[PDB]
Amino acid sequence: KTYTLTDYLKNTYRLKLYSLRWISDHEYLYKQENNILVFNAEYGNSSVFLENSTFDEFGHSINDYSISPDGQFILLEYNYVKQWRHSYTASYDIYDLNKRQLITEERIPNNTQWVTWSPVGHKLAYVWNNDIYVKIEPNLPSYRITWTGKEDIIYNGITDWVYEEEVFSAYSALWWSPNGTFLAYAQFNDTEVPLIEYSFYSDESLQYPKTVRVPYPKAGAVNPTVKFFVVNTDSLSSVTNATSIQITAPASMLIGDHYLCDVTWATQERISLQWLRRIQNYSVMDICDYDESSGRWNCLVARQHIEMSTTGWVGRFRPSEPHFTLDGNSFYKIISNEEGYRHICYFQIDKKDCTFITKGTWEVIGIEALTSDYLYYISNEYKGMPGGRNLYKIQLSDYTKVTCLSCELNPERCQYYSVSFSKEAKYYQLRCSGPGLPLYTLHSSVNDKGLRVLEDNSALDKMLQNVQMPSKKLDFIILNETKFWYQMILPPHFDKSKKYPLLLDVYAGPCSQKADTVFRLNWATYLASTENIIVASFDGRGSGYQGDKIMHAINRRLGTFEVEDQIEAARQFSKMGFVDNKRIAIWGWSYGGYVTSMVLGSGSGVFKCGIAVAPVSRWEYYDSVYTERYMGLPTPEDNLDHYRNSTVMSRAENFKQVEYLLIHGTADDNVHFQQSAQISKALVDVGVDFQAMWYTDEDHGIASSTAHQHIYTHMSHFIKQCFSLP
Amino acid sequence: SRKTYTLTDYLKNTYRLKLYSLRWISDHEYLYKQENNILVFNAEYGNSSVFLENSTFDEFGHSINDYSISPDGQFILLEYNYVKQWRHSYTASYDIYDLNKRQLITEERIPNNTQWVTWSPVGHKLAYVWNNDIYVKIEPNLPSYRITWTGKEDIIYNGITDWVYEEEVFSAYSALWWSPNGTFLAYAQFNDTEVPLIEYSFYSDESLQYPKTVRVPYPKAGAVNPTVKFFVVNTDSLSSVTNATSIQITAPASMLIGDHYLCDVTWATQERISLQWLRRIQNYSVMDICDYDESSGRWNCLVARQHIEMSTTGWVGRFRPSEPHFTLDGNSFYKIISNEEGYRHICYFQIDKKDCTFITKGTWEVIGIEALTSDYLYYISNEYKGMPGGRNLYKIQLSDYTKVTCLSCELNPERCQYYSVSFSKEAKYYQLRCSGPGLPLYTLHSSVNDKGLRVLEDNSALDKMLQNVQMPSKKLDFIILNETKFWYQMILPPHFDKSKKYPLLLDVYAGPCSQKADTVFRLNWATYLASTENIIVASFDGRGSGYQGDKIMHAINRRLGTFEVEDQIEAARQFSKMGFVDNKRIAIWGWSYGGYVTSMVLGSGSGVFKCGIAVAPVSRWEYYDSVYTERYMGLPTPEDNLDHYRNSTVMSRAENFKQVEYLLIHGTADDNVHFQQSAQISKALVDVGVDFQAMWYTDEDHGIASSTAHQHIYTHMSHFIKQCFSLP
Ligand SMILES: N[C@@H](CC(=O)N1CCNC(=O)C1)Cc1cc(F)c(F)cc1F
Ligand SMILES: N[C@@H](CC(=O)N1CCNC(=O)C1)Cc1cc(F)c(F)cc1F
Ligand SMILES: N[C@@H](CC(=O)N1CCNC(=O)C1)Cc1cc(F)c(F)cc1F
Ligand SMILES: N[C@@H](CC(=O)N1CCNC(=O)C1)Cc1cc(F)c(F)cc1F
């Protein structure tokens, strides 16, 4: 017996997580049963913070809780209703922990788009109907900060579609000052933004299908406009209306279309803003500090920090995030150095010259902590493996004494790490995502001492001993003397003598990584375990975490090098003796579906069959912020001619050599069903047969319990059929 | 004949069938296109001149889609820039050409985007519809007259039918009715103001960045229907200052009490017109006969001249009340109505005498009246050999109803037992269109003596190229179920033998008053499946089929999805026990209603069919338009038939699709049976975890008639069949 498709679809062998919430510098909450505990990191003992019966007679079902920073109130989230990738709307009830009652007077309105606490205390701000309301106390009436909230037009406190999906990766457009004082927010105006219209069929009893309409700026279309505002909460008036001071953009940004990409608070009176231009290769860092005189926010032109690029676009997916020191006069920002590798640089608010404190043929992933004596960061520097992750601590007084805190803990089963720090970076938890079963340990920062193991997945590990689990080989091949990485989910009892069918699991998106040391139980696990299928992934040009030399290779050339490298990789995978070159499939989702489609039409005879789920077909169809970031603008004076060259429809004739399976969701707000609609029509006009499958009222995720089981049961047969498997 | 009829020969259309589509310009001559040239043939002796050459508009600069000669012959209407809309509707650009001058008319040209145009029955009076407003053009080069002034897109339809009256009622985009002399122009006005709108996406060429949303006034079962008013105008008394006064003919009080339709408009004489009205509950029609008052200029409809036609066992008519055929004086008319025995035969009526007297009778039905003279009435009926799938032309003397003489039964009973006819102006001659069972044959006859003059087209060229082909044979027979004779047909593969077991495909439609079993000769996908893949394509006509009486047609009345589904399973069970039919390989495929039956049959869990293909199927009858659905289902209300509306959905059988292999196909731009229906089908199958094959067609409507899409769907369905039947 092996890892079956039923196991994957039903979550038979479930990984164990350790979700903890640092409430202080030495205490973190943990989800035990349904009770809430409060662990003392120093001693490992806990004490019950809330029984699982406090909400026994509640009447609804909490989806997520939110204790106030001080610990005097707890916000309850129920009636969850999902919207886009990150956005959602739900209901909220405030619980007075001290009174041990439930707030009934002046309750948060239902259908609230976003809510969040202030960093300290119990001050509360939430967005409802596209407008910002702040409640100094849970029982006090809320103050209306904005009055221009308007559905599908004016977004105050929340991001619109493109900003949520392509920039902030969150529905929240609010930013609290370090302490409960100021509230910064953005205002998005989608008045002149075109609308995407697709049909929604709803439940069986919906006689006339509803037509969904979303402000969706496509490639080169009219983009939404952004305004930034800051308002003081400790001065709100119940008589007159609160005044919000608007922070404008530098002239280098106002000269044309632009975006807002980052908002980070330096000190209690200093706030950092980063602006991006339509043609996203020139960033600007405006540092604003409060003025007690005029009550305005002045941004010293003497404090800017220009960040441009020449080989490609600025930032991986956006300009990096600044990490200001405790005093707000020096920060750390991950940027790509001279040779093209992203490393931690050290800035001065007054000096426009940053000083890199790290360097090498690798990249710093993120900056996780900044104390007085040590800066903490994640990077793929260990053993020159980009697909690996470890935590290094660097001394601020010596840019040479760098210590790794995770490379050597358990190098056998731990090469991909994550960390969560306490409030004052006195302790930290380490997540070991792979290559072995996940591991959760607690550490004390004083001497980087290891305290205990919080979770080791020993319960799960006991089960896999009887099932035939697949092995995962991570290695590299050579393209034009450059070293590119790949991974192979090898079936159980792998024999290099027998010929195996190879399935190429591909994404190939800008700054992507499908080859890593991460342990995961997915559809590829069943394919190799039960069907004895070598499912592999490859990181060609465009893949990130390896320098701008590789990533920026596809700048303005989307659907070219990243497509060729995949073909080239499978070309060399087909000569390994254990790979039946006559049965090499490929499949991809989202961007991967676009590459898969661009591959099956390449006319190379390398691949026999393929599957493309929710693929892009024409870059003019996708949203602007993402598309234009890499392609430019669809104009004959910019890069229109490559927009027209990279369409998968213009490559239909060559689909006669391969079996194709096109799958898409009829409610895909992200990669509109229009994309696959144009693909099928192009194949029809050249007499190319293919398989297809639409999923009614499904989005880009196709995450419905029934839909998810259906699409993977459907693709599995297509693969078994193609490889001639029982 | 070592070669067989393949799918390429069908898709690429190798063996093409010829016709002889003429146009009677009078009682003596007709027009027929020869070799890009329009000719004029003399029915008496077969001589011919040339009415227009290929090198006449050769330099016109427009790919002419169609022409339109005038009754007299002084002008010819040219139709170019054709733009299809729905089934019968479209908008094209028009140009007039003066035959007596050989010059294109340019003064006050007919506007572009014109929705409908047509001359007067005699002369050269012209009336067209532009922006939903009627225009009258007395002379082809003089200014037009603004008849109606309420034209409004998707709201007010003047002179044209909306979507519902175009598909289910008149089967035409035209809402104009000239009087014989052309003096009066009768028209109807539709109002879809309160009608809901169906909204689906249109994707267009690659270059369209944002998908367009198509919105169409479409009344689903239960929703409010469009409202209709009727008007008449005197095309002579055209003021052009005060324009025109549109006299309105009000509907009968029996109809105005509630929702109702306008189902038929037939002119009796130069001053008498008959209007048939239909109620929401399609079982009570009322014909109104109105005369033009020469003193007040009004239109009164005497109650004595008003005729009631109702039905108790179902809906009245096959799809709508029959059209009346009035006499010369316009005081009596012969109309097709259902007998007291349940069969549809011709009845003789009088203007002011309600009790009609049938001139025909028997266990057969009259398909339709083709021509009416002062002494004989020519009609088509499935009487000969008692075959419901046959069509022959009959001639009955109006002074003696025993003088029943068939004109086509005996011409060639071998290759012809299904006839279509086209008479002259006064029926001096008539063309016979034998569609089957042999190769189509076109002939011309003279009614004065009823003798064959000359053969128009015997498709001898087609017969010459089928020599080197292994054609399938077609058998027409019947089985018996509960003392009733139900008919079926099979397309047997060439060299048929009972010593083998054949895969059998059940081609189905099974709609109300339908008939998939007949004698017609066809070259289609079924011919390829039988000729090449050796598949027995069979069809069955039982319970709900027309032309067999009301007791069979009105059986599924207010009960769709039970009798049609049950008989197809019963017939398939019958055919599976004949001997030469294999049990392991039996399928079923249907288009439109046939797709609804195909899905219902597979969802029945009867366990008979290995696979099944449904193309543009109906899901629930709440999704389809009102007039068609409510004609067979009543209203979807608790006090009517809502309970059956819900127990007849195909989604409620998603659980039973685990046994059968399913293939769902539907066009994205389908405005008749919306893609919404198939979307709900797949969603139901997904919610119960049953795998199936699916295929959408971008921008394709309910026809899937595109050149590239037609070949693609049948190529995909051929693979689905060949793999389900394990055929090499
Ligand atoms: N960009 C996403 C990649 C993705 O969607 N995949 C990759 C693998 N195959 C798929 O089909 C789906 C991941 C991602 C999205 C965010 F919004 C974000 F904030 C952070 C993230 F890491
Ligand atoms: N829009 C993209 C957002 C993204 O990639 N990231 C990277 C991780 N960090 C982020 O902030 C967000 C994802 C995406 C790309 C496609 F090409 C596509 F077809 C569909 C998609 F969903
Ligand atoms: N109702 C239509 C049913 C049909 O023939 N089918 C359905 C499936 N696809 C086909 O090609 C065959 C035919 C039809 C006949 C008339 F006489 C008429 F006036 C209007 C019509 F629409
Ligand atoms: N709407 C129907 C019109 C019709 O059948 N006729 C019969 C021949 N004479 C006429 O006047 C029109 C056709 C139809 C029925 C369905 F159930 C369906 F799903 C789709 C369809 F197109």
Swiss-Prot record, chain A:
Tissue specificity comment: Expressed specifically in lymphatic vessels but not in blood vessels in the skin, small intestine, esophagus, ovary, breast and prostate glands. Not detected in lymphatic vessels in the lung, kidney, uterus, liver and stomach (at protein level). Expressed in the poorly differentiated crypt cells of the small intestine as well as in the mature villous cells. Expressed at very low levels in the colon.
Glycan-bearing residues: N45, N52, N110, N179, N189, N241, N281, N480, N645
Cell compartment(s), UniProt: Cell membrane; Apical cell membrane; Cell projection, Invadopodium membrane; Cell projection, Lamellipodium membrane
Effect of N281A: Does not inhibit dipeptidyl peptidase activity, interaction with ADA and homodimer formation
Residue positions of the active site: S590, D668, H700
Pfam families (alphabetical): DPPIV_N, Peptidase_S9
Primary subcellular site in the record, as a coarse category: membrane
Extracellular side: 1-726
GO molecular function ontology, one term from the record: virus receptor activity
Entry similarity comment: Belongs to the peptidase S9B family. DPPIV subfamily.
Record PANTHER family: DIPEPTIDYL PEPTIDASE 4, PROTEASE FAMILY S9B,C DIPEPTIDYL-PEPTIDASE IV-RELATED
Quaternary structure (record): Monomer. Homodimer. Heterodimer with Seprase (FAP). Requires homodimerization for optimal dipeptidyl peptidase activity and T-cell costimulation. Found in a membrane raft complex, at least composed of BCL10, CARD11, DPP4 and IKBKB. Associates with collagen. Interacts with PTPRC; the interaction is enhanced in an interleukin-12-dependent manner in activated lymphocytes. Interacts (via extracellular domain) with ADA; does not inhibit its dipeptidyl peptidase activity. Interacts with CAV1 (via the N-terminus); the interaction is direct. (Microbial infection) Interacts with MERS coronavirus/MERS-CoV spike protein.
Protein name: Dipeptidyl peptidase 4
Organism from which the protein derives: Homo sapiens
Gene of this entry: DPP4
Swiss-Prot record, chain B:
Entry EC no(s): 3.4.14.5
Membrane topology: Single-pass type II membrane protein
Main location: membrane
One Pfam family recorded for the sequence: DPPIV_N
GO biological process: behavioral fear response; cell adhesion; endothelial cell migration; glucagon processing; locomotory exploration behavior; membrane fusion; negative regulation of extracellular matrix disassembly; negative regulation of neutrophil chemotaxis
Enzyme class (EC, first level): hydrolase
Residue spans, topological domain Extracellular: 1-728
Function: Cell surface glycoprotein receptor involved in the costimulatory signal essential for T-cell receptor (TCR)-mediated T-cell activation. Acts as a positive regulator of T-cell coactivation, by binding at least ADA, CAV1, IGF2R, and PTPRC. Its binding to CAV1 and CARD11 induces T-cell proliferation and NF-kappa-B activation in a T-cell receptor/CD3-dependent manner. Its interaction with ADA also regulates lymphocyte-epithelial cell adhesion. (Microbial infection) Acts as a receptor for human coronavirus MERS-CoV-2.
Self-association and partners: Monomer. Homodimer. Heterodimer with Seprase (FAP). Requires homodimerization for optimal dipeptidyl peptidase activity and T-cell costimulation. Found in a membrane raft complex, at least composed of BCL10, CARD11, DPP4 and IKBKB. Associates with collagen. Interacts with PTPRC; the interaction is enhanced in an interleukin-12-dependent manner in activated lymphocytes. Interacts (via extracellular domain) with ADA; does not inhibit its dipeptidyl peptidase activity. Interacts with CAV1 (via the N-terminus); the interaction is direct.
Family: Belongs to the peptidase S9B family. DPPIV subfamily.
Full protein name: Dipeptidyl peptidase 4
Originating organism: Homo sapiens (Human)
Gene that encodes the chain: DPP4
